[PDB]
C-alpha cells in the first residue's frame, strides 16, 4: 500500500485526495493511504522523515521547500515522470523552476497545484468612485489614483451603510509579508535575492527593490489602508471583504467558489460583495508586470520500497484529468498548464482573469537555503510595516532596515 503525506489543501483534505486517486486505485488494484499534516508541523515531520528514513512513499512539499529537501539527498529523481507529462513546455517557466534545486539538471519534485494572487475588487464601489478597473490595475500610477478616488468616494456599502476601506492588506511578520511585497519589488525591477559578483546576495536594499517596497508600504501611510488591516491575516481580511468593509484586496482564486456558496453553507453568495465581484492582475511597475506563484509539488523519498508504483501515482496526480479534478476541490490553479483550457476555468470570467494573471507568474529562486532567506526577509519587512503603523516609514528608514536585512541574508547565504 502506498502512503502519501498531504497538507490541508481542500475542505475535507483526506476525503478529496481519496476521491481523486479512486480511479488509480481501481486500475492498479491498490488502496493509497493518506495522512494530512497541518501546515504548522508539516515541515518538521517531513525533515524527520528525511533524516530517519521513516516516512511515506510520497509527500507534498511547498514549492519553496524543494531546494532544502533536495539538497538532503533523500528525493528520487523524477525527470522520467516530467518527460511523461510533456517536459519543460508542459509548465509555466516559474512552475518548472520549482521542480529542482536551483541549477540542478535533475528534477526532484512534480508540480501539483499553483497558488497565485491577483486583486479582487468591488465592481459597485469602483463604478461609484468613477474608477475604470482596467486602468486602476494596469499601472502603479493608475492603482494609487484609483485608491485616492476610492478614499474620496461618498459610496457606502448597501448592507454596512458605511464607507469601504480602499485597500486591505496585512502587515504581520508572516510568510504572506514577503509574497504580498514580491510583485511590487519585482515590478520595480528588483529582487529579494540575485546572483551578482560571483555569489547569491540580498537585493532587498537595491534602489529598485526599495522603490517597489516604498510604493506599496506608503499606501498604508496615505490613508488608503485602515490601521486595523495591518494586524489581520489573509483569512480575516477575506472575511472583511465578504462583509462589505473593503473595496480591494489581494488573494488567490479560492474566494471565487465561495461567492457562489450560500451563507447557510459557509459561503457569502448573499453579500453585496459576492454580486459585485471583480478580479484584476497586479499592476505593472516601471520594469514589468509580475504575479506571485507559490503552491505545492509532490516528491518521492528515495528510501521508499514502492518507487515504481509511486512514480505511476506521481504521473497520475500530475496529469490532465487529476489536475482538472483536484482544482474543483482546492480552488487552486492546476500546475499543469494544459489543464487551464478546461471549460471549468475558461467559462468562468473570474478564473479566466486568474489565467491571464498566470502569464506573468514568477517564483522565488529554488535555493537550498531559501527558508533562512525568507525568515530574515519576513522579520525585517515586519519591522518596516511596524514603522507604517506609526506613520514613520521614510525612504531612509526603509533603506536602513533593508541594509540590515541584506547583511543578515548575505551572512546566511555564506553558510550551508
Ligand X SMILES: O=S([O-])[O-]
Residues that bind ligand X (CB under 6 A): 404, 408
367 binds Cl ion, rule: CB under 5 A? no
Residues of span 135-164 touching Cl ion by CB under 5 A: none
Question: Least CB distance from residue 207 to ligand X, whole Å?
Answer: 20
Decide if residue 16 touches Cl ion (CB under 5 A): no
> Shortest Cβ distance from residue 206 to ligand X (Å)?
17
* CB 220 to ligand X: min, Å: 21
The answer to whether the beta carbons of residues 75 and 69 sit under 8 Å apart is: yes
Distance separating alpha carbons of residues 67 and 48, to the nearest angstrom: 16
Q: How many residues bind Cl ion (CB under 5 A)?
A: 2
> Contact with Cl ion (CB under 5 A): which of 81, 192, 284, 336?
192
Closest residue to ligand X: CB criterion: 404
Closer to ligand X by CB, 325 or 404: give it. Answer: 404
Q: Which stretch binds Cl ion (CB under 5 A): 183-191, 243-251, 383-391, 406-414?
A: 183-191
d(CA 411, CA 244): 45
Interactions with Cl ion, residue window 43-72 (CB under 5 A): none
CB of 377 to ligand X, least distance (A): 11
Residue 192 binding target from Cl ion, ligand X, none, CB below 5 to 8 Å by type? Cl ion
* CB closer to ligand X, 352 vs 404: 404
Q: Which does 298 bind (CB under 5 to 8 A by kind): Cl ion, ligand X, none?
A: none
Q: Which is nearer to ligand X, 188 or 408 (CB)?
A: 408
Q: How far is the CB of 315 from ligand X (least distance, A)?
A: 45
> How near is the Cβ of 75 to ligand X at its closest, in Å?
33
Residue 191 binds which entry of Cl ion, ligand X, none, CB below 5-8 Å type-dependent:
Cl ion
Q: Give the cell for residue 215.
A: 510604493
Q: For Cl ion, which stretch binds (CB under 5 A), given 12-20, 56-64, 184-192, 260-268? A: 184-192
Indicate the residue among 286 and 382 with the shorter CB distance to ligand X: 382
Show the cell assigned to 302.
528515495
257 or 379: CB nearest ligand X: 379
Per partner kind, with CB cut-offs from 5 to 8 A, the member of Cl ion, ligand X, none near residue 404 is ligand X
Asked if 191 is part of the footprint of Cl ion (rule: CB under 5 A), the reply reads: yes
Residue 408 interacts, among Cl ion, ligand X, none and using kind-specific CB cut-offs from 5 to 8 Å, with ligand X
Please state the closest distance from residue 200 (CB atom) to ligand X, in A.
18
Q: Can you give the chain as a three-state secondary structure string?
A: CEEEEECCCCCCHHHHHHHHHHHHHHHHCCCEEEEECCHHHHHHHHHHHHHHCCCCCEEEEEHHHHHHHHHCCCECCCHHHHHHCCHHHHCCHHHHHHHCCCCCCCCCCEEEEEEECEEEEEHHHHHHHCCCHHHHCCEHHHHHHHHHHHHHCCCCCCCCCCCCEEECCCCCCCCHHHHHHHHHHHHCCCCCEEEECCEEEECCCCHHHHHHHHHHHHHCCCCCCCHHHHHCCHHHHHHHHHCCCEEEEEECCHHHHHCCCCHHHCCCCCCHHHHCEEEECCCEECCECCEEEEEEEEEEECCCCCHHHHHHHHHHHHCHHHHHHHHHHHCCEECCHHHHHCHHHHCCHHHHHHHHHHCCEECCCCCCCHHHHHHHHHHHHHHHHHHHCCCCCCHHHHHHHHHHHHHHHHHHHCCC
Which does residue 393 bind out of Cl ion, ligand X, none, counting CB within 5 to 8 angstroms by kind?
none
Query: Interface with Cl ion by CB under 5 A: which residues?
Result: 191-192
Amino acid at each position: 500500500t502506498l502512503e502519501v503525506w498531504i497538507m490541508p489543501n481542500s475542505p475535507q483534505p483526506a476525503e478529496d485526495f481519496k476521491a481523486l486517486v479512486a480511479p488509480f486505485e481501481k486500475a492498479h488494484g491498490v488502496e493509497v493511504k493518506v495522512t494530512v499534516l497541518d501546515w504548522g508541523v508539516a515541515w518538521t515531520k517531513i525533515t524527520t522523515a528525511a533524516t530517519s528514513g521513516v516516512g511515506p512513499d510520497l509527500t507534498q512539499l511547498g514549492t519553496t521547500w524543494v531546494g532544502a529537501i533536495s539538497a538532503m539527498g533523500v528525493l528520487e529523481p523524477v525527470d522520467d515522470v516530467l518527460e511523461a507529462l510533456g517536459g519543460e513546455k508542459a509548465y509555466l517557466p516559474a512552475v518548472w523552476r520549482t521542480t529542482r534545486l536551483e541549477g540542478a539538471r535533475q528534477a526532484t519534485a512534480v508540480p501539483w497545484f499553483s497558488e497565485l494572487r491577483a486583486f479582487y475588487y468591488r465592481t459597485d464601489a469602483l463604478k461609484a468612485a468613477g474608477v475604470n478597473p482596467a486602468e486602476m490595475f494596469a499601472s502603479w500610477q493608475g492603482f494609487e489614483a484609483g485608491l485616492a478616488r476610492l478614499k474620496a468616494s461618498s459610496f457606502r456599502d448597501p448592507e454596512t451603510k458605511a464607507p469601504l476601506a480602499p485597500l486591505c492588506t496585512p502587515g504581520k511578520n508572516s510568510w504572506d509579508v514577503l509574497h504580498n511585497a514580491a510583485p511590487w519589488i519585482w515590478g520595480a525591477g528588483g529582487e529579494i535575492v540575485r546572483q551578482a559578483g560571483g555569489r547569491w546576495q540580498s537585493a532587498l536594499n537595491s534602489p529598485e527593490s526599495l522603490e517597489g517596497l516604498y510604493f506599496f508600504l506608503s499606501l498604508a501611510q496615505k490613508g488608503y489602508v485602515p490601521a486595523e488591516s495591518l494586524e489581520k491575516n489573509t483569512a480575516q481580511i477575506e472575511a472583511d471583504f465578504q462583509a462589505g468593509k473593503c473595496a480591494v484586496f489581494a488573494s488567490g482564486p479560492w474566494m471565487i467558489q465561495r461567492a457562489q456558496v450560500p451563507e447557510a453553507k459557509g459561503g457569502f453568495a448573499e453579500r453585496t460583495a459576492a454580486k459585485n465581484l471583480g478580479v484584476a492582475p497586479y499592476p505593472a511597475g516601471p520594469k514589468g508586470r509580475y504575479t506571485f506563484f507559490g503552491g505545492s509539488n509532490l516528491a518521492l523519498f528515495n528510501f521508499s520500497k514502492n518507487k515504481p508504483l509511486a512514480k505511476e501515482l506521481l504521473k497520475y496526480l500530475g496529469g490532465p484529468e487529476a489536475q482538472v479534478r483536484y482544482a474543483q476541490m482546492t480552488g487552486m490553479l492546476p500546475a499543469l498548464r494544459s489543464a487551464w483550457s478546461d471549460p471549468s476555468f475558461q467559462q468562468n470570467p473570474l478564473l479566466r482573469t486568474f489565467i491571464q494573471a498566470a502569464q506573468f507568474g514568477r517564483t522565488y529562486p529554488s535555493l537550498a537555503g531559501w527558508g533562512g532567506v525568507e525568515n530574515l526577509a519576513v522579520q525585517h519587512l515586519g519591522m518596516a510595516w511596524d514603522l507604517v503603523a506609526q506613520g514613520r516609514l521614510t525612504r531612509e528608514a526603509l533603506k536602513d532596515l533593508m541594509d540590515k536585512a541584506s547583511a543578515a541574508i548575505n551572512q546566511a547565504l555564506r553558510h550551508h
